[PDB]
Amino acid sequence: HMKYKITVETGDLRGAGTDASVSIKLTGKDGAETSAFSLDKYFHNDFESGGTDTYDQSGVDVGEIAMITLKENGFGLKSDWYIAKVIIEKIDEATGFSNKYIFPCYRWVIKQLVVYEGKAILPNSKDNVKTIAEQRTKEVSENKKLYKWGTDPRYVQDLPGFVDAEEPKSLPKDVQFTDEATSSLFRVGLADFANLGLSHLFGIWDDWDCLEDFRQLITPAIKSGLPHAAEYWRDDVWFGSQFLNGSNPEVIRRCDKLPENFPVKNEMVEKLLDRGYTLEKAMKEGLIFITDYKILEGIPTMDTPEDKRYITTPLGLFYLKNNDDIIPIAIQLYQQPGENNSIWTPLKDTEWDWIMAKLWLRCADTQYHQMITHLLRCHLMMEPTAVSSWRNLPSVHPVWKLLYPHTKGIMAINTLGRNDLIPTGGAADKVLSIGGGGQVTLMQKHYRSVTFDSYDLVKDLRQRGVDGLRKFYYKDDALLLWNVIHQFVQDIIQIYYNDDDSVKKDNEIQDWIRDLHENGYPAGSDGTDKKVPKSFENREELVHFLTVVVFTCSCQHAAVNFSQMATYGFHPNSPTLMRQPPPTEKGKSNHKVIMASLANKHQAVTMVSVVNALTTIYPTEKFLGDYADNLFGDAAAHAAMAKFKSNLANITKQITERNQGMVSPYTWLIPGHVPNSIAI
Numbered sequence: 001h002m003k004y005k006i007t008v009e010t011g012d013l014r015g016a017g018t019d020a021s022v023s024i025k026l027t028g029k030d031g032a033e034t035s036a037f038s039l040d041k042y043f044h045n046d047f048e049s050g051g052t053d054t055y056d057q058s059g060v061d062v063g064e065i066a067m068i069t070l071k072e073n074g075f076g077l078k079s080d081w082y083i084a085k086v087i088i089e090k091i092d093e094a095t096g097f098s099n100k101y102i103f104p105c106y107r108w109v110i111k112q113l114v115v116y117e118g119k120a121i122l123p124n125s126k127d128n129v130k131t132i133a134e135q136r137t138k139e140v141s142e143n144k145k146l147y148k149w150g151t152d153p154r155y156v157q158d159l160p161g162f163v164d165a166e167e168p169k170s171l172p173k174d175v176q177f178t179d180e181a182t183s184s185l186f187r188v189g190l191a192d193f194a195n196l197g198l199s200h201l202f203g204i205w206d207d208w209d210c211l212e213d214f215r216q217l218i219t220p221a222i223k224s225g226l227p228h229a230a231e232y233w234r235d236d237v238w239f240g241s242q243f244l245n246g247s248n249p250e251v252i253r254r255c256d257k258l259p260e261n262f263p264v265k266n267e268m269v270e271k272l273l274d275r276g277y278t279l280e281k282a283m284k285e286g287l288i289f290i291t292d293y294k295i296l297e298g299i300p301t302m303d304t305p306e307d308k309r310y311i312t313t314p315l316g317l318f319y320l321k322n323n324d325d326i327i328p329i330a331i332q333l334y335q336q337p338g339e340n341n342s343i344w345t346p347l348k349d350t351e352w353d354w355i356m357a358k359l360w361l362r363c364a365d366t367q368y369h370q371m372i373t374h375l376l377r378c379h380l381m382m383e384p385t386a387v388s389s390w391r392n393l394p395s396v397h398p399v400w401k402l403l404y405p406h407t408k409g410i411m412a413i414n415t416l417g418r419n420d421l422i423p424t425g426g427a428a429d430k431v432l433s434i435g436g437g438g439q440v441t442l443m444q445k446h447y448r449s450v451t452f453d454s455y456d457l458v459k460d461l462r463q464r465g466v467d468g469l470r471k472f473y474y475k476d477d478a479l480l481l482w483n484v485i486h487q488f489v490q491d492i493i494q495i496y497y498n499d500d501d502s503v504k505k506d507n508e509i510q511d512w513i514r515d516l517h518e519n520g521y522p523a524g525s526d527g528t529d530k531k532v533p534k535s536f537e538n539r540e541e542l543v544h545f546l547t548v549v550v551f552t553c554s555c556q557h558a559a560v561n562f563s564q565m566a567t568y569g570f571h572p573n574s575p576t577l578m579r580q581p582p583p584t585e586k587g588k589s590n591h592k593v594i595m596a597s598l599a600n601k602h603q604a605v606t607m608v609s610v611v612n613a614l615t616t617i618y619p620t621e622k623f624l625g626d627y628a629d630n631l632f633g634d635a636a637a638h639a640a641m642a643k644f645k646s647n648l649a650n651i652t653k654q655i656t657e658r659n660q661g662m663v664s665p666y667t668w669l670i671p672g673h674v675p676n677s678i679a680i
């Protein structure tokens with residue numbers, strides 16, 4: 001008969017129970033299938049995870065094994081078996097050679113799981129034989145029943161599509177949190193204050209005595225230590241650089257002509273410029289940049305008897321110094337000029353007034369960063385690609401394998417976010433001045449006008465006129481990673497798609513992109529098309545769109561997420577809310593007045609607890625290029641992935657050499673620090 005040496009490698013996850021026994025039915029390339037063997041698996045203790053189990057077997061010969069089927073075979077206290085991969089060694093009677101068939105899995109068996117052999121196969125391929133072709137249709141059909149487009153009324157309007165799930169637990173086990181502690185990370189109760197050693201500040205609504213006391217929030221519980229911001233935040237040079245190398249580099253842009261509603265006169269800023277330069281000359285030469293937060297106009301701030309918060313709709317003007325530092329030179333708190341809305345300037349205003357003006361500009365930026373730059377443009381805008389993958393692509397498809405490690409965990413975290421971050425009562429609601437409902441409205445307002453053109457990094461930075469800035473470290477690093485990721489995606493795609501026709505006739509990728517265009521990214525209530533293709537007509541379109549996804553799920557998220565402690569650690573560097581309205585007159589600002597506007601003690605601790613949670617990196621995390629749970633079997637794919645890792649290693653080396661001798665190096669896009677996906 002036919003001998004089969006089946007080796008099962010258990011993954012790093014471990015469910016509850018003992019009897020993890022299952023049955024395995026092999027299936028040959030030509031349809032010849034065997035009988036359900038019985039794999040006995042028993043877990044000694046609860047902690048143990050991983051390991052190998054080898055089984056010798058005998059049954060009907062099938063030839064080349066194209067796929068395997070797994071079914072729960074446990075009797076008492078059945079435990080869901082999380083399997084990394086299966087290796088079946090046999091011999092082809094045709095030429096009596098020992099051949100191994102690797103089956104990359106990384107799934108919980110639960111009920112019944114079918115796993116293809118490593119080789120990736122397009123539906124319009126020649127290797128898509130009958131047995132494969134019939135299975136992949138069933139797989140996708142089954143998945144569509146588990147992964148539907150959500151209709152939660154809270155989030156159906158002016159937002160990207162999302163998965164249908166009431167809670168993280170109501171999701172399929174395969175896309176749940178890989179750590180149970182995660183589900184309870186954004187709760188900010190007394191115990192969370194206590195974890196940071198700050199429970200004595202819980203419920204304390206007093207002002208901070210002075211600006212330096214915010215350093216009290218950095219206890220040994222905060223392992224990153226005291227942010228450099230604590231030492232530099234007052235410096236105009238540091239201030240300017242926070243709009244480039246902080247957590248939100250999406251707003252500032254070259255200004256060739258002032259908005260009519262921002263009447264900055266040369267007299268106000270002339271001595272801040274270079275000798276021999278006027279405001280007009282500076283603009284002609286492209287030395288003037290601006291941060292306009294018009295989008296905050298109309299967004300309501302929290303207004304309750306016991307909690308009132310404020311925000312403005314400011315404009316900031318910056319100057320590109322001769323040594324490549326940008327500095328703030330003018331600020332207007334509200335869009336429309338008026339008697340109570342003057343232009344602030346370090347040349348014409350007091351030092352305390354200037355500090356106040358800067359704090360209000362950063363506060364506006366915080367609103368933008370949290371809701372638009374982070375949550376919307378990373379978390380929510382990327383989720384649709386994960387949902388569409390499950391609904392339209394079989395696990396044998398090369399694109400499914402490509403995106404899998406990068407979309408991992410996004411559905412889980414977003415489902416939690418929809419309950420504990422975004423809604424009223426959530427984290428954002430507790431720390432942002434636009435909390436109380438406005439945080440969602442701000443996202444909706446950006447979405448109504450968003451298109452995927454704003455995701456083309458190269459062209460976005462270019463049309464903003466900021467891609468030439470020497471000390472814009474995010475830009476330099478992001479552009480290296482973008483081009484390296486684009487190369488990788490292109491290599492993979494050109495392995496399986498020989499030409500543009502290969503892309504047209506791939507019915508499965510066409511279902512994928514069509515589902516995104518229709519349900520993933522609805523135009524919104526302004527009818528603004530999001531510029532997601534109706535179909536992929538060539539390989540270049542396919543590569544670009546996928547480059548956007550991989551880059552956003554890994555690099556972009558990392559840059560605007562894990563840098564949050566350096567940015568918000570010291571609250572004054574980037575205020576989350578204001579408890580008093582802005583000043584209406586000059587000369588009124590001083591230390592104590594400022595302390596009355598800035599967050600109180602309880603509020604400040606809440607932010608640190610949140611930021612500390614958002615920057616959680618588990619020891620298991622896999623960083624950019626590290627594909628340990630690789631689904632690719634083709635040796636050509638491995639070559640592409642290895643070249644990828646080599647290109648990343650070179651970027652790491654560049655960033656390190658540039659960061660040499662710096663006090664506060666930009667380190668958030670070092671490949672080894674960039675997770676593969678959005679899992680937090």
Ligand SMILES: OC[C@H]1O[C@@](CO)(O[C@H]2O[C@H](CO)[C@@H](O)[C@H](O)[C@H]2O)[C@@H](O)[C@@H]1O
Pocket residue numbers: 467468469470471475476477479
């Ligand atoms: O500061 C220049 C720096 O920017 C890079 C991208 O990181 O190139 C950009 O700026 C150049 C001008 O110096 C442009 O020619 C180029 O088109 C733009 O991408 C780096 O090449 C350069 O070191």
Ligand SMILES: [Fe+2]
Pocket residue numbers: 374379557561614678680
């Ligand atoms: Fe995040």
